[PDB]
Write a protein that binds this DNA or RNA. Structure first.
Ligand code: CA
Ligand code: CA
Length: 461
RNA sequence: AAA
């Protein structure tokens, strides 16, 4: 059992417990291929190793080996053949691949190669190489493999910064991980910009990196400093590196600024390079949604003639793009929610209902997204289905998710409005009386609350 | 990646 025990000591994709959902594998592979072709990084060993791991998980071990050989080939060709400790991730993945394929003598050869380097570098472990480069590689693998992995990814980069606070690579990984984690909390009450100072430092230490600049710009926009952020957008757009990536995030920036035409132009250019990107399709859909809203507000909700044809174009284009996003990544929960909401605008309540029903079964990494699912379904039930019974059920389910948020507040307010409406038709509706007491209780008005609960108890005679 |  010596071989397997040794393999478990290696630091590589096989031992990093990457959270990779089978339903997210097609999208992951597309994003890995996009990164190989279009993300300009100093080293590409990591991303080829991840492609090899993906091929392995697909049952394509020979294809996996080709990606590991490419990782080794690129290590020397683009860095003057110098020896680099990142190669140990590749060698670890070779050892595992050959173990799985039954090429056990070769597996041992790669273990021996790793051991030889750990000894040369006075590493304390025989196979587990302790160096910041491999902490970074572990972090980048985690960061690519889905939101479930992001606290772990951030901790990989943090471990490096605790020793070397001006390390450019881990500064960047820490900032990106922190930015995405801030995004998970962006609608929670009293959320804070933990990623802002990390992003400033990452830009300082990586001055040619336009990817980091556009994230800094977006966080500045979040924090009400749009003008400062736009300066970073312009710097990034002046650099040719990583364009689909600079363009996707700059397009978000411009959309949120209100320059929707500019956003769409950037996104359509990005789509030429990465047509499978679910982020691009979702962002394009959001641009059409914004233009739909613009048309409605200019025609006070009653477009006719060409304006109506334009509105329908926006609705059907947003549906097309949100459908494209969820076909490619069926676990993309918020794209389903935008899609359901757009089917309401198209007047297709059955397809809205279908997508809400799918959403109600999902288990999002961001648990608070279920508040929005219940809230918007409750509104659909109230306003499109004319079902107060089901609206109440789902407003209550949103409220039962206790985390304080924009949507939980809206759910309390929507329930209050619905119940007040029902009481104006029937002042002695016992259920509505107690629900109004519940609402007042959640708001803090304990005397008004108990009045209504009491009143409701009285009624039960 | 909605918000
Ligand atoms: Ca390039
Ligand atoms: Ca290739």
């Amino acid at each position: 059992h010596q071989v397997k025990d040794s393999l478990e000591q290696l630091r590589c994709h096989f031992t990093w417990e990457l959270s990779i959902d089978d339903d997210e594998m097609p999208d992951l592979e597309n994003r890995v291929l996009d990164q190989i072709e279009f993300l300009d990084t100093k080293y590409s060993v990591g991303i080829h190793n991840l492609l090899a791991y993906v091929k392995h998980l697909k049952g394509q071990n020979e294809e996996a080996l080709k990606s590991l050989k490419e990782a080794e080939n690129l290590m020397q060709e683009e860095h003057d053949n110098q020896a680099n400790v990142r190669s140990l991730v590749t060698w670890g993945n070779f050892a595992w691949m050959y173990y799985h394929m039954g090429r056990l003598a070769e597996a041992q050869t790669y273990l021996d190669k790793v051991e030889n380097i750990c000894k040369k570098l006075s590493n304390p472990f025989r196979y587990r190489m302790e160096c910041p480069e491999i902490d970074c590689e572990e972090g980048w693998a985690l960061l690519k493999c889905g939101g479930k992995n992001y606290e772990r990814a951030k901790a990989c980069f943090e471990k490096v910064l605790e020793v070397d606070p001006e390390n450019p690579e881990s500064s960047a990984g820490y900032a990106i991980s922190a930015y995405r984690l801030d995004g998970f909390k962006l609608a929670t009450k009293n959320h804070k910009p933990f990623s802002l100072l990390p992003l400033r430092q990452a830009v300082r230490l990586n001055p040619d990196n336009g990817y980091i600049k556009v994230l800094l710009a977006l966080k500045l926009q979040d924090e009400g400093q749009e003008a400062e952020g736009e300066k970073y957008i312009e710097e990034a757009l002046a650099n040719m590196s990583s364009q689909t990536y600079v363009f996707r995030y700059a397009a978000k920036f411009y959309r949120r600024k209100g320059s929707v035409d500019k956003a769409l132009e950037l996104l359509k250019k990005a789509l030429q390079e990465t047509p499978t990107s679910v982020l691009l399709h979702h962002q394009i859909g959001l641009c059409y949604k914004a233009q739909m809203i613009q048309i409605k507000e200019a025609t006070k909700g009653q477009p006719r003639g060409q304006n109506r044809e334009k509105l329908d174009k926006m609705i059907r284009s947003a549906i097309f793009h949100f459908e494209s996003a969820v076909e490619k990544k069926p676990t993309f929960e918020v794209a389903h929610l935008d899609l359901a909401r757009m089917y309401i605008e198209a007047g297709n309540h059955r397809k809205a209902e279908e997508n809400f029903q799918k959403l109600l079964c999902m288990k999002p990494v961001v648990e608070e997204t279920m508040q929005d699912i219940h809230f918007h379904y409750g509104r659909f039930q109230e306003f499109q289905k004319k079902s107060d019974v089901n609206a109440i059920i789902h407003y209550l389910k949103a409220i039962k998710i206790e985390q304080a948020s924009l949507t939980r507040d809206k759910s309390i307010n929507s329930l209050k409005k619905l119940v007040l409406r029902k009481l104006r038709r029937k002042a002695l509706d016992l259920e509505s009386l107690s629900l109004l007491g519940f609402v007042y209780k959640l708001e803090g008005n304990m005397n008004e609350a108990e009045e209504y609960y009491e009143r409701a108890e009285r009624l039960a005679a």
